[PDB]
Amino acid sequence: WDIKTSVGTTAVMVAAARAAETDRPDALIRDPYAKLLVTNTGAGALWEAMLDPSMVAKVEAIDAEAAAMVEHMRSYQAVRTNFFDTYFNNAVIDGIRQFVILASGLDSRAYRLDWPTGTTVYEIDQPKVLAYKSTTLAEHGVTPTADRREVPIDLRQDWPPALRSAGFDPSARTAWLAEGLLMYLPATAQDGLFTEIGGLSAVGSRIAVETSPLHGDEWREQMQLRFRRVSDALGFEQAVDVQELIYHDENRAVVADWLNRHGWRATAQSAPDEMRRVGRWGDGVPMADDKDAFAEFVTAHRL
């Protein structure tokens, strides 16, 4: 692969999760391109084997608790993807034609969703990662289903100027997306992010965001010990590496509250409520009754 960053590993682990849901007869979501994106890394073999539905029983024989986290991730990623897909579909139906995916990673929406002509989808993320995604797909004969414009820059760097020279039109309504991002930014970087987003946002722009959970790093500690127990058990040569939330005990604005104080109307749907509505929630997970252990999904329109 030769992408060895943390965005790299996480990108692979969540794509692995989507691929595993995808091959199922009643998939909650289907990403035809996850499996390919993972394979061509070389570094996902392990996630593939752990998350494969046909392995449920071998995994369970190892540890019933890790068994439940493996399940929880499969379900979580499916439900997350489902939610944001729905959000992107509603923007479309309500007439929105400009779309920015932040830290786009190996997200493949620009290629798999159905977009009306005249739609533009800007992808912002790291040079290498974007190159990797588009070369791979390009080569397997996969073409965007929208006018996909790469903005190759680090999210913690000066990205507004490069979004604009990619053609972004700050006066069209925009549907912004930030999945798998906030837990990993320091808190001021969060405020800076929404400030920069607000400034580029025309009346009626929407934003969807996964938020960082208060107790999110306790739960990271568990994925680690569990997932390590499982690949040790599975004979996988190479140590699991779950991205740490290093800024976890920095003082963080509550995201809806913050948007509502800055020109948006926002709502939070907590991940557990969302997983419950679609029937994918296990009371048998660890930290089940730590509401604060899980992200919220936050939606807002620009006033």
UniProtKB/Swiss-Prot annotation:
Functional note: Exhibits S-adenosyl-L-methionine-dependent methyltransferase activity.
The entry sums up its family as follows: Belongs to the UPF0677 family.
Q: Which EC numbers characterise this protein's activity in its record? A: 2.1.1.-
GO biological process terms, alphabetically, are: methylation
The alphabetical list of record keywords is: Methyltransferase, S-adenosyl-L-methionine, Transferase
PANTHER family with a match to the protein in the record: S-ADENOSYL-L-METHIONINE-DEPENDENT METHYLTRANSFERASE YKTD-RELATED, S-ADENOSYL-L-METHIONINE-DEPENDENT METHYLTRANSFERASES SUPERFAMILY PROTEIN
**Protein name per its UniProtKB record:** Putative S-adenosyl-L-methionine-dependent methyltransferase ML2640
Q: Please tell me where S-adenosyl-L-methionine binds in this chain.
A: 125, 154-155
Species of the source: Mycobacterium leprae (strain TN)
* Record keyword S-adenosyl-L-methionine present: yes
EC supergroup of this enzyme: transferase
One annotated GO molecular function is: methyltransferase activity
Q: Name one Pfam family in it.
A: LCM
